[PDB]
């Protein structure tokens, strides 16, 4: 199912600041119940292709490609830091005729952006669904999941990051399949490869993202402070219904379950998967989001 071109034929484009962003939108401009799906690294809105159909009968579903990723525009200055993504994503939020409140569904760096957007736009949030998410700064390279303890310091956050990612597409060719339980069809793999076909700066988003991970003591301090701030808000957010979709065995999920154990007003459902759990349990994730929306209403 689902070529890259079939998925992106369903998506529209919108000008955003000095560039353009691609996004899925099941109901352009409608102010009915609305859900926004945010992917992370190194994926795109394609990641949600099998989840969204379970939610669409209840809600307008939007799923943007983050700037520099999917079919969204590439930036000539190739500056793809968290604050740069948040600039373009915030403008996108203001450009797609959203209703007064929305539910955010987010994954990985999509949750970093989504949690931050929510923290800055608190009266626009009717619920948050998060999975394999960025819920806290990390204490050190020790609190990272075991399969990546060495991958993140050495290599990507090093001088060697450029050659592994920009030249040999390490995040797409190695990391992505390494945290999916099944093996992707080459159709699905080509859909993930398409935004980063050309070697060089086109792949810079997949290298800047691991360099943004908030490691206390290392940095970056600006992301560390963004994450601490929205963690503080989330941990006392009694009025914001939350659904944590726990991946078993997961990647970040074990650590997230601990960070969020006492978060008020958070329900947990568990599904099978590693980090990219949408590729192993999209049906269960979609039906859990559908249940969550019905509880909100």
Short mmCIF file of C-alpha atoms in Angstrom, two decimals:
data_model
loop_
_atom_site.label_atom_id
_atom_site.label_comp_id
_atom_site.label_asym_id
_atom_site.label_seq_id
_atom_site.Cartn_x
_atom_site.Cartn_y
_atom_site.Cartn_z
CA UNK A 1 0.00 0.00 0.00
CA UNK A 2 0.86 3.69 -0.51
CA UNK A 3 3.51 4.85 -2.92
CA UNK A 4 5.25 8.07 -2.00
CA UNK A 5 3.58 9.71 -4.97
CA UNK A 6 0.09 8.53 -3.97
CA UNK A 7 0.55 9.98 -0.48
CA UNK A 8 1.94 13.26 -1.69
CA UNK A 9 -0.79 13.56 -4.36
CA UNK A 10 -3.27 13.84 -1.48
CA UNK A 11 -1.29 16.72 0.06
CA UNK A 12 -1.48 20.43 -0.63
CA UNK A 13 1.09 23.22 -0.41
CA UNK A 14 1.04 26.64 1.26
CA UNK A 15 3.51 29.51 1.25
CA UNK A 16 5.18 29.87 4.65
CA UNK A 17 7.47 32.87 5.31
CA UNK A 18 10.09 32.83 2.51
CA UNK A 19 9.43 29.18 1.65
CA UNK A 20 6.65 26.60 1.24
CA UNK A 21 5.36 23.67 3.28
CA UNK A 22 3.56 20.57 2.11
CA UNK A 23 0.83 19.07 4.25
CA UNK A 24 -2.01 16.59 4.29
CA UNK A 25 -5.45 18.11 5.00
CA UNK A 26 -8.55 15.93 4.95
CA UNK A 27 -10.99 18.93 5.08
CA UNK A 28 -9.45 22.20 3.92
CA UNK A 29 -10.63 25.18 5.96
CA UNK A 30 -13.28 23.38 8.01
CA UNK A 31 -13.59 24.30 11.68
CA UNK A 32 -14.99 20.96 12.80
CA UNK A 33 -13.00 18.88 15.30
CA UNK A 34 -9.38 19.07 14.12
CA UNK A 35 -6.27 16.95 14.76
CA UNK A 36 -2.71 17.89 13.78
CA UNK A 37 -0.12 15.11 13.31
CA UNK A 38 3.55 16.10 13.74
CA UNK A 39 6.33 13.77 12.58
CA UNK A 40 9.99 13.92 13.63
CA UNK A 41 13.40 12.78 12.33
CA UNK A 42 13.99 11.54 9.62
CA UNK A 43 10.42 11.03 8.54
CA UNK A 44 7.57 13.14 7.09
CA UNK A 45 3.77 13.19 7.00
CA UNK A 46 4.11 9.84 5.16
CA UNK A 47 4.71 8.35 8.64
CA UNK A 48 1.00 8.93 9.50
CA UNK A 49 -0.44 7.50 6.26
CA UNK A 50 -1.90 4.39 7.94
CA UNK A 51 -2.90 6.09 11.20
CA UNK A 52 -4.90 9.04 9.84
CA UNK A 53 -7.61 6.88 8.13
CA UNK A 54 -8.81 5.73 11.56
CA UNK A 55 -9.17 9.36 12.73
CA UNK A 56 -10.46 11.12 9.59
CA UNK A 57 -14.12 9.96 10.02
CA UNK A 58 -14.20 11.94 13.30
CA UNK A 59 -12.03 14.92 12.48
CA UNK A 60 -10.27 17.15 10.03
CA UNK A 61 -6.75 15.69 9.92
CA UNK A 62 -3.71 17.80 9.08
CA UNK A 63 -0.17 16.46 8.77
CA UNK A 64 2.58 18.87 7.70
CA UNK A 65 6.00 18.04 6.37
CA UNK A 66 8.46 19.91 8.60
CA UNK A 67 10.55 22.45 6.71
CA UNK A 68 13.37 20.85 4.75
CA UNK A 69 11.66 17.45 4.99
CA UNK A 70 9.06 15.51 3.02
CA UNK A 71 7.86 17.72 0.19
CA UNK A 72 8.34 20.98 2.09
CA UNK A 73 10.76 23.54 0.71
CA UNK A 74 14.50 23.38 1.28
CA UNK A 75 16.14 26.41 2.86
CA UNK A 76 19.14 28.00 1.09
CA UNK A 77 20.84 28.89 4.40
CA UNK A 78 20.23 25.22 5.43
CA UNK A 79 19.71 26.33 9.04
CA UNK A 80 17.35 23.67 10.43
CA UNK A 81 17.70 24.13 14.18
CA UNK A 82 14.77 23.65 16.54
CA UNK A 83 14.07 27.39 16.58
CA UNK A 84 14.17 27.49 12.77
CA UNK A 85 11.67 24.64 12.50
CA UNK A 86 9.48 26.30 15.10
CA UNK A 87 9.49 29.57 13.10
CA UNK A 88 8.19 27.88 9.93
CA UNK A 89 5.86 25.48 11.77
CA UNK A 90 4.29 28.32 13.80
CA UNK A 91 3.67 30.26 10.58
CA UNK A 92 2.16 27.12 9.05
CA UNK A 93 -0.21 26.84 12.03
CA UNK A 94 -1.38 30.38 11.32
CA UNK A 95 -1.78 29.67 7.60
CA UNK A 96 -4.15 26.69 7.42
CA UNK A 97 -7.39 28.17 8.82
CA UNK A 98 -7.47 26.21 12.08
CA UNK A 99 -10.43 26.24 14.51
CA UNK A 100 -10.17 27.80 17.95
CA UNK A 101 -8.83 24.62 19.62
CA UNK A 102 -7.02 21.59 18.15
CA UNK A 103 -5.67 18.21 19.25
CA UNK A 104 -1.96 17.65 18.64
CA UNK A 105 -0.70 14.12 17.82
CA UNK A 106 3.07 14.07 17.87
CA UNK A 107 6.17 11.91 17.62
CA UNK A 108 9.88 12.48 18.37
CA UNK A 109 10.95 16.01 17.38
CA UNK A 110 7.36 16.57 16.27
CA UNK A 111 6.56 16.39 19.97
CA UNK A 112 9.33 18.85 20.84
CA UNK A 113 7.79 21.32 18.38
CA UNK A 114 4.22 20.41 19.34
CA UNK A 115 4.79 20.61 23.10
CA UNK A 116 6.48 23.97 22.62
CA UNK A 117 3.69 25.27 20.38
CA UNK A 118 1.16 24.11 22.99
CA UNK A 119 3.13 25.72 25.82
CA UNK A 120 3.09 29.04 23.92
CA UNK A 121 -0.55 28.75 22.74
CA UNK A 122 -2.20 27.19 25.77
CA UNK A 123 -5.74 28.37 25.00
CA UNK A 124 -5.59 26.64 21.57
CA UNK A 125 -5.05 23.07 22.91
CA UNK A 126 -7.92 20.68 23.54
CA UNK A 127 -5.72 17.56 23.86
CA UNK A 128 -2.28 16.09 23.24
CA UNK A 129 -1.39 12.58 22.04
CA UNK A 130 2.32 11.85 22.24
CA UNK A 131 4.52 8.83 21.55
CA UNK A 132 8.29 8.24 21.58
CA UNK A 133 8.41 11.92 22.49
CA UNK A 134 10.79 14.55 23.93
CA UNK A 135 9.41 15.07 27.44
CA UNK A 136 12.47 16.23 29.40
CA UNK A 137 16.11 17.19 29.03
CA UNK A 138 18.41 14.18 29.33
CA UNK A 139 20.72 13.94 32.33
CA UNK A 140 23.66 12.89 30.18
CA UNK A 141 24.68 10.56 27.41
CA UNK A 142 23.81 7.79 29.92
CA UNK A 143 20.05 8.49 29.90
CA UNK A 144 19.83 7.94 26.13
CA UNK A 145 18.47 4.52 25.02
CA UNK A 146 21.06 1.76 25.00
CA UNK A 147 21.09 1.10 21.23
CA UNK A 148 22.14 4.73 20.57
CA UNK A 149 24.43 5.57 23.54
CA UNK A 150 27.48 5.53 21.23
CA UNK A 151 25.73 6.67 18.02
CA UNK A 152 24.87 10.12 19.39
CA UNK A 153 28.21 11.41 20.89
CA UNK A 154 30.65 9.87 18.48
CA UNK A 155 29.65 10.42 14.87
CA UNK A 156 26.55 12.59 14.57
CA UNK A 157 27.28 15.21 17.21
CA UNK A 158 30.95 15.08 16.11
CA UNK A 159 32.98 16.32 13.15
CA UNK A 160 32.14 12.97 11.52
CA UNK A 161 28.42 13.79 11.45
CA UNK A 162 28.66 15.60 8.12
CA UNK A 163 30.13 12.70 6.15
CA UNK A 164 27.85 10.04 7.67
CA UNK A 165 24.66 12.00 7.06
CA UNK A 166 25.19 14.44 4.21
CA UNK A 167 27.21 11.98 2.11
CA UNK A 168 26.04 8.51 3.24
CA UNK A 169 22.51 9.34 4.52
CA UNK A 170 23.07 7.47 7.79
CA UNK A 171 19.78 8.43 9.38
CA UNK A 172 17.67 7.23 6.45
CA UNK A 173 19.63 4.14 5.42
CA UNK A 174 20.66 2.84 8.86
CA UNK A 175 18.80 4.42 11.80
CA UNK A 176 15.30 4.38 10.27
CA UNK A 177 15.16 0.61 9.52
CA UNK A 178 16.97 -0.13 12.82
CA UNK A 179 13.95 1.00 14.88
CA UNK A 180 11.16 -0.60 12.85
CA UNK A 181 10.24 -4.18 13.83
CA UNK A 182 9.05 -5.28 10.39
CA UNK A 183 11.02 -4.62 7.20
CA UNK A 184 9.69 -1.84 4.98
CA UNK A 185 8.75 -2.58 1.39
CA UNK A 186 11.02 -0.79 -1.03
CA UNK A 187 8.04 1.39 -1.98
CA UNK A 188 7.80 2.59 1.62
CA UNK A 189 11.58 2.96 1.89
CA UNK A 190 11.71 5.02 -1.32
CA UNK A 191 9.06 7.33 0.14
CA UNK A 192 11.36 8.02 3.09
CA UNK A 193 14.39 8.38 0.76
CA UNK A 194 12.74 10.78 -1.69
CA UNK A 195 13.26 14.06 0.29
CA UNK A 196 16.97 13.29 0.70
CA UNK A 197 17.86 11.79 -2.69
CA UNK A 198 20.46 14.44 -3.49
CA UNK A 199 23.65 14.21 -1.39
CA UNK A 200 24.76 17.25 0.56
CA UNK A 201 22.78 19.96 2.29
CA UNK A 202 19.37 18.47 1.43
CA UNK A 203 20.10 15.98 4.22
CA UNK A 204 21.10 18.64 6.77
CA UNK A 205 17.74 18.33 8.63
CA UNK A 206 18.50 14.71 9.52
CA UNK A 207 21.89 15.78 10.98
CA UNK A 208 20.82 18.95 12.79
CA UNK A 209 18.02 17.14 14.64
CA UNK A 210 20.30 14.78 16.64
CA UNK A 211 22.49 17.79 17.37
CA UNK A 212 19.47 19.48 18.99
CA UNK A 213 18.84 16.73 21.58
CA UNK A 214 18.86 18.47 24.99
CA UNK A 215 21.72 16.89 26.97
CA UNK A 216 22.15 18.60 30.34
CA UNK A 217 25.77 19.67 30.66
CA UNK A 218 26.43 19.48 26.92
CA UNK A 219 23.65 21.47 25.26
CA UNK A 220 22.09 23.08 23.41
CA UNK A 221 21.03 25.27 26.32
CA UNK A 222 18.30 27.06 24.35
CA UNK A 223 16.57 23.75 23.55
CA UNK A 224 17.22 22.55 27.12
CA UNK A 225 15.38 25.62 28.40
CA UNK A 226 12.54 25.23 25.90
CA UNK A 227 12.05 21.61 26.97
CA UNK A 228 12.31 22.35 30.70
CA UNK A 229 9.69 25.06 30.29
CA UNK A 230 7.12 22.93 28.52
CA UNK A 231 7.90 19.96 30.79
CA UNK A 232 7.10 22.18 33.78
CA UNK A 233 3.78 23.18 32.18
CA UNK A 234 2.89 19.63 31.10
CA UNK A 235 3.64 18.17 34.51
CA UNK A 236 0.94 20.33 36.16
CA UNK A 237 -1.46 20.54 33.18
CA UNK A 238 -4.58 19.26 34.95
CA UNK A 239 -6.89 20.86 32.33
CA UNK A 240 -5.20 19.34 29.26
CA UNK A 241 -6.28 15.74 28.48
CA UNK A 242 -3.23 13.75 27.41
CA UNK A 243 -2.77 10.31 25.82
CA UNK A 244 0.69 8.71 26.04
CA UNK A 245 0.97 5.93 23.46
CA UNK A 246 3.61 3.64 24.98
CA UNK A 247 5.62 1.48 22.57
CA UNK A 248 6.51 -2.05 23.73
CA UNK A 249 9.44 -2.61 23.73
CA UNK A 250 9.90 0.95 22.44
CA UNK A 251 12.96 3.14 22.41
CA UNK A 252 12.38 6.28 24.47
CA UNK A 253 9.12 4.85 25.83
CA UNK A 254 10.49 3.25 29.02
CA UNK A 255 12.13 6.54 29.99
CA UNK A 256 9.02 8.56 29.06
CA UNK A 257 6.76 6.33 31.17
CA UNK A 258 8.96 7.23 34.14
CA UNK A 259 9.15 11.00 33.47
CA UNK A 260 5.36 11.26 33.01
CA UNK A 261 4.22 8.77 35.68
CA UNK A 262 2.62 11.48 37.83
CA UNK A 263 1.52 13.77 35.00
CA UNK A 264 -2.08 14.74 35.78
CA UNK A 265 -4.82 13.78 33.35
CA UNK A 266 -2.74 11.42 31.18
CA UNK A 267 -4.02 8.07 29.96
CA UNK A 268 -1.59 5.44 28.69
CA UNK A 269 -2.18 2.82 26.02
CA UNK A 270 0.52 0.38 24.95
CA UNK A 271 1.13 -0.85 21.40
CA UNK A 272 3.83 -2.95 19.78
CA UNK A 273 6.78 -1.08 18.28
CA UNK A 274 10.25 0.35 18.61
CA UNK A 275 10.87 4.09 17.96
CA UNK A 276 8.91 4.27 14.67
CA UNK A 277 5.89 2.56 16.17
CA UNK A 278 3.54 3.90 13.45
CA UNK A 279 5.18 1.42 11.04
CA UNK A 280 4.47 -1.55 13.33
CA UNK A 281 1.07 -0.76 14.92
CA UNK A 282 -0.73 1.98 12.89
CA UNK A 283 -4.17 0.36 13.31
CA UNK A 284 -3.93 0.23 17.11
CA UNK A 285 -2.50 3.77 17.28
CA UNK A 286 -5.24 5.15 15.05
CA UNK A 287 -7.99 3.44 17.02
CA UNK A 288 -6.49 4.69 20.28
CA UNK A 289 -6.50 8.26 18.94
CA UNK A 290 -10.08 7.75 17.76
CA UNK A 291 -11.06 6.60 21.26
CA UNK A 292 -9.25 9.60 22.76
CA UNK A 293 -11.17 12.05 20.55
CA UNK A 294 -14.48 10.48 21.57
CA UNK A 295 -13.57 10.95 25.22
CA UNK A 296 -12.77 14.63 24.62
CA UNK A 297 -16.24 15.04 23.10
#
